[PDB]
Amino acid sequence: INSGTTCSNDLLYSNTEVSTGVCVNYDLYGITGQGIFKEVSAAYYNNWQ
Amino acid sequence: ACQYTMCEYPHTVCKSKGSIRNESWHIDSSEPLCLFKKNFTYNVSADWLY
Ligand SMILES: *[C@@H]1O[C@H](CO)[C@@H](O[C@@H]2O[C@H](CO)[C@@H](O)[C@H](O)[C@H]2NC(C)=O)[C@H](O)[C@H]1NC(C)=O
Ligand SMILES: *[C@@H]1O[C@H](CO)[C@@H](O)[C@H](O)[C@H]1NC(C)=O
Ligand SMILES: *[C@@H]1O[C@H](CO)[C@@H](O)[C@H](O)[C@H]1NC(C)=O
Ligand SMILES: *[C@@H]1O[C@H](CO)[C@@H](O)[C@H](O)[C@H]1NC(C)=O
């Protein structure tokens, strides 16, 4: 107990509910904020970004 | 990234054509209290790494 790396849930749902169009709340990957998603197709991200 | 037990004479032995000696850089055969463990990859034909 309280030693190791096998932890518990302790957190939120992580729901795939990307609700574009409306002003929302977010905590994306550690960064918190409020915004409006607007889906686009882009190709500049690399596989660790 | 764990709590191993390093040696006074710790050394590595290659796997292609290994040396005369045995690779013995630590003897900690009791799966110590690890804080981290990961597996990564790279190019097998690269010359430089950073
Ligand atoms: C990361 O890769 C290493 C390299 O294969 C893995 O270590 C092997 O573990 C098995 C199972 O105990 C042994 O039979 C092999 O001899 C180990 N290889 C070496 C080079 O020591 C390791 O298990 C991998 N870890 C993860 C999390 O994938
Ligand atoms: C305003 O409402 C309409 C329909 O309810 C919606 O299509 C539009 O995106 C909304 N505007 C904003 C900025 O959310
Ligand atoms: C290296 O390890 C093997 C396997 O335990 C052992 O038989 C051998 O004696 C070791 N080498 C030396 C020089 O002791
Ligand atoms: C990287 O790996 C690929 C395939 O494994 C190979 O074709 C390429 O030559 C390698 N590049 C370098 C710089 O080693």
For chain B, what is the total number of helices (H) and then of strands (E)? 0, 0
Are the C-beta atoms of residues B34 and A4 closer than 8 Å to each other? yes
Size of interface A-B (CB pairs under 8 A): 7
Experimentally, the structure was elucidated by: cryo-EM
Buried-exposed string B3-40: b where 16+ CB fall within 10 A, e elsewhere:
eeeeeeeeeeeeeeeeeeeeeeeeeeeeeeeeeeeeee
What is the residue with the minimal CA distance to atom 20 of ligand 1? Answer: B15
The encoded tokens of residue B48 equal 């430089």
Which residues in chain B are contacts of A3 at CB distance < 8 A?
33
Closest to A24 (Cα-Cα) out of A34, A33, A32: A34
Are the C-beta atoms of residues B7 and B27 closer than 8 Å to each other? yes
CA gap B31, A24 in Å, rounded: 46
For residue B36, what is the DSSP state? -
Between chains, do B36 and A3 touch, taking CB under 8 Å as contact? no
Are the C-beta atoms of residues B33 and B2 closer than 8 Å to each other? yes
Question: Structure resolution in Å?
Answer: 3.0
